[PDB]
Amino acid sequence: LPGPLRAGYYDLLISIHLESACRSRRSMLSEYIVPLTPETRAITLFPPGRKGGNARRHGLPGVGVTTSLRPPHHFSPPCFVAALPEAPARLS
Amino acid sequence: CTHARSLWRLEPLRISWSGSHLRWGQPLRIRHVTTGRYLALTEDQGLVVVDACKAHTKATSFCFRVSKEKLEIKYGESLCFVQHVASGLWLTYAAPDPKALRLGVLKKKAILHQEGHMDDALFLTRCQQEE
Amino acid sequence: YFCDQELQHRVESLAAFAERYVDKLQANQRSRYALLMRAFTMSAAETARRTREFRSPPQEQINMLLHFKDEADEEDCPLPEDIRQDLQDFHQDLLAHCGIQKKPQSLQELVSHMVVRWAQEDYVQSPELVRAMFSLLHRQYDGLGELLRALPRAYTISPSSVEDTMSLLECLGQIRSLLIVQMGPQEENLMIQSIGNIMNNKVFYQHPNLMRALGMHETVMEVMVNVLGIRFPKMVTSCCRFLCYFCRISRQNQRSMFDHLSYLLENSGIGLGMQGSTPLDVAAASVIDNNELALALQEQDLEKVVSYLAGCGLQSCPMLLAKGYPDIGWNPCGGERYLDFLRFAVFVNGESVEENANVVVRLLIRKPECFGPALRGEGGSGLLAAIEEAIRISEDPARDGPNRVHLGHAIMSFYAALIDLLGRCAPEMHLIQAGKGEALRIRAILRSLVPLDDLVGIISLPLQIPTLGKDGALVQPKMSASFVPDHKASMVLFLDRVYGIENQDFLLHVLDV
Amino acid sequence: RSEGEKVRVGDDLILVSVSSERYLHLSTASGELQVDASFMQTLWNMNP
Amino acid sequence: TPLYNLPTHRACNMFLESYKAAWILTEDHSFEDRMIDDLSKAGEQEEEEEEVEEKKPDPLHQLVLHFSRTALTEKSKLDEDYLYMAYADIMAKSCHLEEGGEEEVEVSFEEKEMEKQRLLYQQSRLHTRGAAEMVLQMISACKGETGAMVSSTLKLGISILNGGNAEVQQKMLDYLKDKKEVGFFQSIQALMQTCSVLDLNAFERQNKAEGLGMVNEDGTVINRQNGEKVMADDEFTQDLFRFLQLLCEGHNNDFQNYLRTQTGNTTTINIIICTVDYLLRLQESISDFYWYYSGKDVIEEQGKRNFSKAMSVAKQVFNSLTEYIQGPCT
Amino acid sequence: GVEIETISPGDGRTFPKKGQTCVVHYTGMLQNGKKFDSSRDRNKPFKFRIGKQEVIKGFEEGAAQMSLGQRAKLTCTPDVAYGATGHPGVIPPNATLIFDVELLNLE
Amino acid sequence: DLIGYFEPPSEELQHEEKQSKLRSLRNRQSLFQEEGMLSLVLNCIDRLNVYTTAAHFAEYAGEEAAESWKEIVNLLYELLASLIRGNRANCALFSTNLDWVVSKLDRLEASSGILEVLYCVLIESPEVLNIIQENHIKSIISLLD
């Protein structure tokens, strides 16, 4: 595929399938509210070495356990045969 | 104050050597740069801007006086009064208008009065060559 | 993205350790309190310990417990050595994780070396890319500062309140999703529904600190600024109701909302004030019942509201003759709201603030047109004449009618509000006995504004007593049209505040009529 | 003119009573020009 | 009242705030000098190639050029920028190490000379890449509006100008004379006009509010207080005059004449007269404070603090006035 | 109404009734052969139930008329379709819809 | 001469000099607009838009005067586009003139010029976007059709 067409199709897919949810989650990511759960208290700042005798070693980012509350995404399957009917706004 | 409507061109009444510095009481003409009209005094609606055909030395001649007394100019902060040549009239504000006040307008019409006021002194500010 | 994930991991670990530490702290405090209560042989020392360590606000107590960072000041902390050692270990672990102390073993080193190498290799020409790399590099060097700035937005909640909280979050998101879209009917309806759902949630009033941290008041104020900068009055009413309720939730919310007082008062107008809850009501809620906020009031806001009062007192209100009511020449109902705001500002907790009262009376005497046709040097109508004229105006429908709004009652309501405002601006009795020059001057000015004869005469005016009239049908005086005793109450408050009771003869004369 | 600036001769002034907080107004309503302390303002010249 | 009876989440929040206020905030980490040194190194661009005359800008040079481009961008008003604040603070701290020093003991002459050379080199690390023009552009773009970015710019300018550096003064003078703009002095005049003085009404209101002392959702103590409402932004008003006095440091008649009259421009602003006017207003405020406190037998602590603040500001203004005429500028 | 024409024969006896669940792989198109719907692109059969009027009346009648395992073509006139108030940006305000449906996995 | 007078600064210049030239162009455009030059150009365009074709104009002014009719129309549209380009106030002045530029979109003479004028107005003024109606969009689609 030509470069402009490739970029256009990628951007079209992102815009029509992922833009709204990404924007909402990006807005929600600013705050850090956390509940008191057994999983919450199990979080350790430093992951201990499996072999042992090793400390102060950072774990890989984005692989631990997160407990901050983030609302889940909502989507509606596309369908152009259902009967056409305040009314809630349509979903992605 | 930034628009082009307030641009006035000074032309000394001397036939040549107009580029020399102005003198107190020297007769001259004031022209509107954008419209091409010349300031003048007439008997029918006082002082107005007229065309070049009707512009004569009897009505279009004005002089810069140091003060209101009857009997060279620094470019800024000179307080040079304006007096019509061959007349004892001076440029001044038309007395405050209640109707103008009603419309809170700033159009303080200009009138040529034999005594004017004490605020008749004014400064001259040169505009850029671009304007 | 990965840096944000690292910061989130750090804050989550901090919260988990906070819970773990606070459990042990509570247990230790319980044990020490039990020891203090059971063993009180050293009664003086026991009393001193109970006064200092206990019987104190929880924040001060926990600040005292955590004041052992330096060994010099560690003597004042009764915490055990093991607990202090545990906190020191956690602090050391946090410092090590933040990077406080070749192959870039860690992400921070890799990012820093990458940014430096990119900068050295070529002269970057894209401003966005340059800003991105420099911001990222600054985050790498200032991770501890980043955590410090991110801490205020951190919050901890109980597991039993998560569900509703999530719902609240969802609603908030919808409101945010409506910021980037131009205002319209559907967006207005969704905003109203989201605001109502925010109203009905229990978490909204259970955790006011959480709502302040999320900054929902700033969001709704931004939306109101957008809609005001009239079309869509319902949305403005909903925003004003939300702000008033938010102020009524807690005192810190009132302090936070007091900052926007200038804009709220500037945007307060007759047209905006005609329908529903108004920004003037928001300002009144932000200023009501708070003494230090009342003292913090600036004189420019009082000048602005006095100017609005004078303006509405000079000319009639456009919608009154738009409906078809006869022209009168001024706006009593418009000025009623300003008078109410002024008396709310002046009078707090049953007492009068002398500074605000003096400023208000100075502005009022500086602009006599605020007093309307009556109490006017050029006019000289008089209180009794004005009230009788209003009564006879309300008696006949030729001038009273054009009803939703009756001008005859409006005249009496406005004059009563003005009299009440002047009454509560009077100085305190203790200042009067103290002989303060300013208090005597203010009292003399108030006595010069209105006389006693008008007060007694207007109090002597009777009412419209509801008579039986027709059998089985009560002929009642329809309210908001006739003379109600509210005017009498406010202005006898004036009489007590300013003139008081001179002697027994005056008291008997007042009681007689 | 502004506050804190020395007053000069031939300068309009506004006089306010300290005790009563009223200007030295010139009343002309009755057809006879009189002076009274009232809320209306009137300019005065203090000529040496 | 007991802490053990509080809910777990509320106690966790209280402990989090206490730990943030008592431990994290008090911890000090120094990274400005190391970051500036790392950014100042050119790497191996000159080693890989030397035929290019201008070579390539240093990473610090690119950073200051980016900030200068943002400042020079035509906008209605200057907007808040946290990154610029952070980098300006880092640079100012980096060049303030020698000035800040980072039972009296006599200091050897040689030690003073080495300290001065160290300060000169630290300032040369910054002003050789465009910081001197950047601070002028940022000040001009502020349009005479009080804010945090103008404070950061003034602090950076003071740090650069510390010790009366002649090179930076020459650079700023050359830039100002070449551009021939009026925004800089207009903004300076506006900022000087917005300076605050002693306020007696605010003092009375603050004293009464302290006398009340009723808590607002904070246990027993109101937890609501600032520096003082009688004199706010005193640090900013000292920084402005410190920057102005550093411009004319060293008896350089060029600045002493440029400040009085800005020749070559369409409008001239007399900064000296503005300083005199501000001093007159401050003197009037101090006289009013003295008149109020004359009746009282003993000055209270709040009055002493207000007097100290006002006298410190007056001292800075007096020093600036001395700087304007220290050289025989007729 | 809806016109039905068979394409491939079905089971022939197991006809759906009200209250059952039917999955269909269909391909909708305009009258001018302008395709706008196809369940094969999503690789997921479309599930619906007869009796809750979730889908247009013509689609329900066509699905109920034909048996299990049958491939048939349905023509839906506008009055049983969206009619004048058609889908904005998808369907013109007056057009008949051609569907190529195939019933499978009746429940 | 006027079209060459209002030429935008080159994109290859330095940032500071480009900004200075942009400021000079903006104030020059404002000075020319405030004196009624834009209204004068609009009046000339309205006067010249009465005649549909060059032959029709020649029926009233002769062939020699009608030889340059299309060139004059194109120059007028280019001058208007240059006057309103990059100026928010000048574009906002077209709030009441939106129909004036829309109704001439289908005209064969200077179609590119009027299209460029409409593009300049739309990309600068939110007000014209707020007052956009269905018929204008239908006309824009008819342009493609």
**G14 and E CB contact within 8 Å:** no
Contact A31 C1 (CB under 8 A): no
Residue set of the binding site of E: 249, 323
Cα angle: C424, vertex C430, C433; to 5 degrees: 115
Given an 8 Å threshold on Cβ–Cβ distance, is C57 in contact with E221? yes
Provide the CB-side half-sphere exposure for E275 (13 A, CA): 25
**Beta strands B28-32 and B110-113, pairing class:** unpaired
Instruction: Return all residues near E90 (Cβ < 8 A) that are at least 6 apart.
Output: E32, E35, E36
8 Å CB contact between B65 and B81: yes
What 8-state DSSP symbol labels residue D15?
-
Locate G134 and state its tokens: 């269905």
Contacts of C377 in chain D (CB under 8 A): 38-40
Q: CB B21: neighbour CB atoms within 10 A?
A: 9
> Do D and C touch, counting CB pairs below 8 Å (3 needed)?
yes
Q: Which of residues 42-81 of C touch E (CB under 8 A)?
A: 54-63, 66-67, 69
Residue B46's DSSP bridge partners are: B42
Tell me which chain E residues have a C-beta less than 8 angstroms from the C-beta of G15: 69, 72
CA distance C138 to E204: 45
Local structure of C154: helix, strand or coil: strand
**Packing angle, helices C2-38 and C143-150, rounded to 10:** 60
Residues of C in contact with A69 (CB under 8 A): 162, 165-166, 169
What distance in Å separates residue D23's CA from the closest CA in chain C? 10
Go through C275-311 and write b for each residue having 16 or more CB atoms within 10 A of its CB, e for each that does not.
eebbbbbbbbbbbbebbbbbbbbeeebbbbbbebbbb
Q: Does any CB of chain D come closer than 8 Å to the CB of residue C368?
A: yes
CB-based contact B4 G24, cutoff 8 Å: no
Q: What residues form DSSP beta bridges with B40?
A: B48
Residues 6+ apart with CB under 8 A from E218: C57, C59, E224
Question: C142: which residues sit within 8 A by CB, 6+ positions away?
Answer: E31, E86
Q: Which residues of chain E make contact with D5, given a CB cutoff of 8 A?
A: none
Task: Identify the sign of the CA torsion B63, B67, B72, B78.
Answer: negative
Distances (CA, A) of B47 to B7, B109, B112, C485, E167: 18, 10, 7, 67, 59
Measured from the Cβ of residue B65, the count of other Cβ atoms closer than 10 Å reads 17
E12 — contact with chain A (CB < 8 Å)? yes
Catalytic residues of F: 26, 36-37, 56, 82, 99
d(CA C116, CA E35): 10
Nearest CA in chain E to A34: E9
Angle at E250 between CA E246 and CA E251, to 5 degrees: 110
What whole-number distance in Å separates Cα of residue E245 and Cα of residue E164? 9
Cβ-nearest to E69 among G15, G22, G23: G15
Chains within contact range of chain B (3+ C-beta pairs < 8 Å): G
Q: Give the CA angle between residues E169, E171, E173 to the nearest 5°.
A: 70
Residue E63, chain C, CB below 8 Å: the answer is yes
Return binding residues of E for Ca(2+).
249, 323
- Estimate the crossing angle of helix C332-346 against helix C299-314, to 10 degrees: 160
Residues 6 or more apart whose CB falls under 8 angstroms from that of E240 comprise E154, E188, E191, E192, E195
* CATH class for the region spanning F1-107: alpha beta
Residues of G in contact with E62 (CB under 8 A): none
Distance CA C319, CA C274 (A): 9
**Closest-approach residue (CA) in chain E for C136:** E83
Instruction: For residue C190, give the nearest of C171, C211, C216 by alpha carbon.
Output: C171
Other beta carbons within 10 angstroms of residue A29's beta carbon come to 14
Q: Check CB contact of C31 with chain E, cutoff 8 Å.
A: no
Contact, G113 vs G74, CB < 8 A? Answer: yes
> Between chains, do E73 and G23 touch, taking CB under 8 Å as contact?
no
Specify the long-range contacts of residues E206-211, CB closer than 8 Å, at least 24 apart.
Answer: E206/E230, E206/E302, E207/E302, E208/C295, E208/C355, E209/C291, E209/C292, E209/C295, E209/C296
Distance CA F42, CA E139 (A): 60
Which run of H or E residues covers position F90? none
> Backbone dihedral region of E28: left (phi > 0), alpha (psi from -120 to 50 degrees) or beta?
beta
Among C108, C135, C155, residue whose Cα is nearest residue C11: C155
d(CA E131, CA E160): 8
Tell me the C-alpha distance between C284 and C344, whole Å. 7
Q: How many CB atoms neighbour CB E87 within 10 A?
A: 26
Q: Which of E66, E67, E72 to mutate to test the interface with G (most CBs of G within 10 A)?
A: E72
Task: In whole angstroms, give the CA distance from residue F98 to residue F32.
Answer: 9
Distance from CA of B1 to the nearest CA of G (A): 12
Q: Do D39 and C368 touch (CB under 8 A)?
A: yes
Find the residue in G nearest to B34 (Cα).
G35
Answer whether B3's CB lies under 8 Å from G36's CB: no
Contacts for C214 with CB less than 8 Å, ≥ 6 apart: A31, C172
Q: Are the CB atoms for C87 and C21 separated by under 8 Å?
A: yes
Eight-class DSSP state of F13? S
Contact E53, E123 (CB under 8 A): no
> HEC states along chain E?
CCCCCCCHHHHHHHHHHHHHHHHHCCCCCCCHHHHHHHHHCCCCHHHHCCCCCCCCCCHHHHHHHHHHHHHHCCCCCCCCCHHHHHHHHHHHHHHCCCCCCCCCCCCCHHHHHHHHHHHHHHHHHHHCCCHHHHHHHHHHHCCCCCCHHHHHHHHHHHHHHCCCCHHHHHHHHHHHHHHCCCHHHHHHHHHHHCCCCCCHHHHHHHHHHHHHCCCCCCCCCCCCCCCCCCCCCHHHHHHHHHHHHHHCCCCCHHHHHHHHCCCCCCCCCCHHHHHHHHHHHHHHHHHHHHHHHHCCCCCCHHHHHHHHHHHHHHHHHHHHHHHHHCCCCC
> How far, in Å, CA of C507 to CA of A71, rounded?
70
Q: How far is CA C171 from CA A12, A30, C214, in A?
A: 28, 16, 12
Q: How far is A62 from chain E (nearest CA, A)?
A: 24
Q: Which residue of C has its CA nearest to E16?
A: C18
Residues in CB range of G126: below 8 A, 6 or more apart? none
Token pair in block for residue C401 = 């009618």
Determine which of F2, F29, F46, F98 to mutate to test the interface with A (most A C-beta atoms within 10 Å): F46
Contact flag C18-E43 (C-beta cutoff 8 Å): no
Chains in contact with E, counting 3 or more C-beta pairs less than 8 Å apart as contact: A, C, D, G
| Domain range summary for chain F, segments of one domain joined by + | 1-107
Does A27 sit within 8 Å of C106, measured CB to CB?
no
E262: closest CA of chain C, how far (Å): 35
Alpha helices in C258-317 (DSSP H): 261-267, 270-274, 279-287, 291-295, 299-314
Separation CA C328–CA C406 (nearest Å): 12
Q: Can you give the length of chain C in residues?
A: 513
Residues F43, F70 contacting (CB under 8 angstroms): no
Question: What are the tokens at E171?
Answer: 């650079």
Q: How far is CA D25 from CA C364, C374, D1, D28, D39, in A?
A: 18, 21, 21, 9, 8
Closest CA to F45 of F98, F90, F107, F103: F103
Cα–Cα separations (whole angstroms), residue C301 to C263, C264, D31, E246? 10, 10, 40, 40
Residue B42 vs residues B13, B48, C64, E104: alpha-carbon distances, Å:
19, 7, 91, 88
The distance in angstroms from the start CA to the end CA of chain E is 71
Which of the 8 DSSP states describes residue B38?
E
Query: Using the beta-carbon criterion (under 8 Å), do A84 and F37 form an inter-chain contact?
Result: no
Indicate the residue type of C495.
Answer: L
Report CB contact under 8 Å: E45, C120.
Answer: yes
Q: Do D39 and C377 touch (CB under 8 A)?
A: yes
Using CB atoms, which residue from C365, C368, C377 is nearest to D21?
C365
Q: Are G117 and G128 in contact (CB under 8 A)?
A: no
In degrees and rounded to multiples of 5, residue C352 shows phi and psi of -110, 130
Partners of residue D24 on adjacent β-strands? D37
Q: Where do we find the tokens 């969001």?
A: C219
Between the alpha carbon of residue E279 and those of residues C379, E237, G48, G118, the distances in Å are 48, 12, 68, 58
- What gap in Å lies between CA E309 and CA E285, rounded to an integer? 12
Task: Show Cβ contacts of residue C113 under 8 Å, excluding neighbours closer than 6 positions.
Answer: C104
The residue assigned the tokens 């290859």 is G12
Residue B130 burial (CB count, 10 A): 8
Q: What's the DSSP call for residue E108?
A: P
Burial class (CB in 10 A: 0-12, 13-18, 19+), C443: middle
**E323, E248 in Cβ contact below 8 A?**
yes
Q: Which two tokens stand for residue G67?
A: 């030889």
Please judge whether E73 and G19 are an interchain contact, meaning their C-beta atoms are less than 8 angstroms apart: yes
Decide: helix, strand or coil at residue E256: helix
C362 touches chain D (CB under 8 A): yes
Contacts of E25 in chain C (CB under 8 A): 148
CB-closest option in F26, F54, F99 to A82: F54
Task: Give chains near C: 3+ CB pairs under 8 A.
Answer: A, D, E
**8 Å CB contact of C58 and E43:** no
| Shortest Cα distance, chain C CAs vs residue D17, angstroms | 12
> For residue G135, what is the enclosing H or E element?
helix G134-144
In chain E, residues 109-138 whose CB comes closer than 8 Å to chain C: none
How many Å apart are CA C351 and CA C347, to the nearest integer?
Answer: 6
Tell me which of D25, D39, D41, D42 to substitute to probe the interface with C (most C C-beta atoms closer than 10 Å). D39
Chains D and G touch (3+ CB pairs under 8 A): no
Shortest Cα distance, chain G CAs vs residue E65, angstroms: 11
Q: Are strands F97-104 and F71-76 parallel, antiparallel or unpaired?
A: antiparallel
**Closest CA relative to residue E150, chosen from E240, E244, E234:** E240
C-alpha C407 chain-centroid distance: 32
Interface-testing mutation among C359, C363, C441, C447, with chain D (most D C-beta atoms within 10 A): C441
Beta strand residue intervals within chain A, DSSP E: 32-35
